[PDB]
Design a protein around this ligand. Structure first.
Ligand SMILES: Cc1cc2nc3c(=O)[nH]c(=O)nc-3n(C[C@H](O)[C@H](O)[C@H](O)COP(=O)(O)OP(=O)(O)OC[C@H]3O[C@@H](n4cnc5c(N)ncnc54)[C@H](O)[C@@H]3O)c2cc1C
Ligand SMILES: NC(=O)c1ccc[n+]([C@@H]2O[C@H](COP(=O)([O-])OP(=O)(O)OC[C@H]3O[C@@H](n4cnc5c(N)ncnc54)[C@H](OP(=O)(O)O)[C@@H]3O)[C@@H](O)[C@H]2O)c1
Ligand SMILES: CCCCCC(=O)O
Length: 529
């Protein structure tokens, strides 16, 4: 008989909600282990300047509690890291969840014990305990990726990853270097350029970026949104990307050149990178002329905004508009600042980090006090592979994932009885809170069913999982997304497999898949009594 009914790993959006359901709704004995010193997951760790979410604030939140929806106010269109952290803290208080969240506790081992049919979980702290159900809410974008750049550890000043931003660090008036220009890099750069004495950008691959449209909320708009929240959430849940806008059904090449320009301009003026990729035309990410047209539209704005022709050239990507789409408050305009310098690593690669800065292949030592790694994450599977996580057959999860990470439905794993993942591999690529709520609710129901019916294990079959791999691959091969090199398909860490790691059918379709599996009696699962 186990120490706990369930153990949940992680105290981000995922685990907070998981806990709430397993404890407050099902009345189970549950504990959460979180390695951080406080709850919030992403929004605990990512304390860097400019950290914020690109999901517009009205839908970057839970939806399951209608009271909370209507009581909580947000004051700017998009939510800053501190505003989201404060929200997740308020949820934690609201639901009396802190008492079952054990902070500072890294789970190092999770071992299915076939004798007892229980999960045995070990912490860095040398606690081992048993639970019937394990839920892993480890975060898709949680495990910092810090490349082994030569000389990195010789750097004399403050060297930090964005995902480890120390609360004491004030970059005001300092000479700041940043490596990486994805969504983290670029929003850091915008905010950091207002603070630092000099900001040096080390850019390996330029990205496309559109305006965010960020700005203050009017209390009447907040009221309007809240009046209509039921409707708003219905739209979200039947949408593709769940960002609170209706995706376009217009093929981009089916209108005039003037119409393409106007639709793009209109989306540019309103802002949001997901709006620009999906609310403009329906085939930006499937049709290559449609994509090329979106991309050229962005290039023309770079060339207009950026006054130095050389900087504009270095900023202008030539590859597909098919990475996670960015937005920012005046990203390209930042490079007209006099305290910002752009180094292209295609032309002048980093040779060595040295005590006083970064020496590039040109021989130039860029002298710096702070070196910021916005070099992203061992995404999706990183925290799973770094855990001593072993299933029924005693094999480490790495031995099940030799071609890429796998699951059934993004939330279960063949060979891993009674384990459920929140934002596991091959789940939705959407505004994440509502995908999380879908997962959590679905897991709950199943755990509750095993409970009421006296099941001992629940496990997806090997065939069900391999069917889901097929599905995810086939959906991704109908898109351009696999032709974009990023973390989304792995390989952003040399030696990491290149592989499909998301269900790209969208939230509405992903919810339907979940509800079909439930409602048909969990075909694909072995339900042992
Ligand atoms: C800068 C930034 C901006 C983003 N903007 C958006 C956005 O606009 N829209 C959007 O949908 N998503 C965005 N995301 C993704 C974001 O991660 C999700 O929105 C959401 O916060 C995920 O919550 P989660 O609980 O699944 O994972 P996380 O919030 O990543 O929480 C996972 C937790 O698990 C803990 N943990 C991991 N492994 C272990 C272990 N072995 N033992 C113990 N604890 C462990 C971690 O320390 C972490 O606290 C953004 C991410 C970042 C980093
Ligand atoms: N605004 C938001 O809502 C927001 C903010 C931050 C993060 N996020 C989410 O988090 C995801 C990850 O974002 P991210 O920007 O943190 O990571 P990222 O998209 O993985 O970008 C990593 C950056 O570091 C660079 N890089 C990696 N290895 C390097 C090396 N060895 N040398 C030099 N440069 C290197 C990459 O260049 P290459 O492209 O050449 O590899 C890229 O510019 C986003 O895509 C998004 O989903 C969202
Ligand atoms: C896995 C990430 C899904 C999209 C939310 C984001 O880009 O932050």
């Amino acid at each position: 008989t186990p120490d706990l009914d369930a153990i949940v790993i992680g105290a981000g959006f995922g685990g907070i909600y998981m806990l709430h359901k397993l404890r407050n709704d099902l009345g189970l004995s549950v504990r959460v282990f979180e390695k951080g010193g406080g709850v919030g997951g992403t929004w605990y760790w990512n304390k860097y300047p400019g950290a914020k979410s690109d999901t517009e604030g009205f839908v970057y939140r839970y939806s399951f509690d209608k009271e909370l929806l209507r009581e909580y106010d947000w004051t700017t269109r998009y939510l800053d890291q501190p505003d989201v952290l404060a929200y997740l803290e308020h949820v934690v208080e609201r639901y009396d969840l802190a008492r079952d969240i054990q902070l500072n506790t890294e789970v190092t081992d999770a071992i299915f014990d076939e004798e007892t049919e229980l999960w045995r979980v070990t912490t860095a702290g040398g606690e081992t305990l048993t639970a019937r159900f394990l839920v892993t809410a480890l975060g898709l974008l949680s495990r910092s990726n810090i490349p082994d750049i030569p000389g990195r550890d010789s750097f004399a000043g403050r060297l930090v990853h964005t995902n480890a931003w120390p609360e004491d660090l004030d970059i005001t008036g300092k000479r700041v270097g940043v490596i990486g220009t994805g969504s983290t890099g670029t929003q850091f750069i915008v905010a950091a350029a207002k603070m630092a004495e000099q900001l040096t950008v080390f850019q390996r691959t330029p990205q496309y970026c559109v305006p965010s449209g960020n700005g203050p909320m009017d209390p009447d708009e907040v009221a309007r949104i809240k009046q209509n929240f039921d409707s708003i959430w219905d739209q979200v849940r039947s949408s593709t990307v769940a960002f609170g806008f209706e995706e376009s059904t217009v093929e981009a090449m089916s209108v005039s050149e003037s119409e393409r320009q106007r639709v793009f301009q209109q989306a540019w003026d309103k802002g949001n990178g997901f709006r620009f990729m999906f609310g403009t035309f329906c085939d930006i990410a499937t049709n290559p002329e449609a994509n090329a047209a979106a991309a050229a539209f962005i290039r023309s704005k770079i060339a207009e905004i950026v006054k130095d022709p050389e900087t504009a050239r270095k900023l202008t990507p030539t590859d597909l508009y098919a990475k996670r789409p960015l937005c920012n408050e005046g990203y390209y305009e930042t490079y007209n600042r006099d305290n910002v310098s752009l180094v292209s690593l295609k032309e002048t690669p980093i040779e060595e980090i040295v005590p006083q800065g970064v020496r590039t292949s040109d021989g130039v030592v860029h002298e710096l006090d702070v070196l910021v790694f916005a070099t992203g994450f061992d995404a999706v599977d990183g925290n799973y592979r770094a855990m001593n996580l072993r299933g029924r057959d005693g094999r480490h999860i790495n031995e099940h994932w030799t071609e890429g990470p796998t699951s059934y439905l993004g939330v279960t794993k063949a060979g891993f009885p009674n384990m459920f993942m929140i934002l596991g591999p091959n789940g939705p690529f959407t505004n994440l809170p509502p995908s999380i709520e879908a997962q959590v609710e679905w897991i709950s129901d199943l755990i509750d069913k095993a409970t009421r019916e006296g099941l001992t294990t629940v496990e997806p079959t090997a065939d069900a999982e391999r069917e889901w791999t097929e599905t995810c691959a086939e959906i991704a091969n109908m898109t351009l997304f696999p032709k974009a090199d990023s973390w989304i398909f792995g390989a952003n860490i040399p030696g990491k497999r290149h592989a499909v790691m998301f269900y790209l059918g969208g939230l509405g379709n992903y919810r339907r898949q979940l509800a079909d599996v439930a409602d048909g009696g969990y075909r694909g699962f072995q339900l042992r009594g």
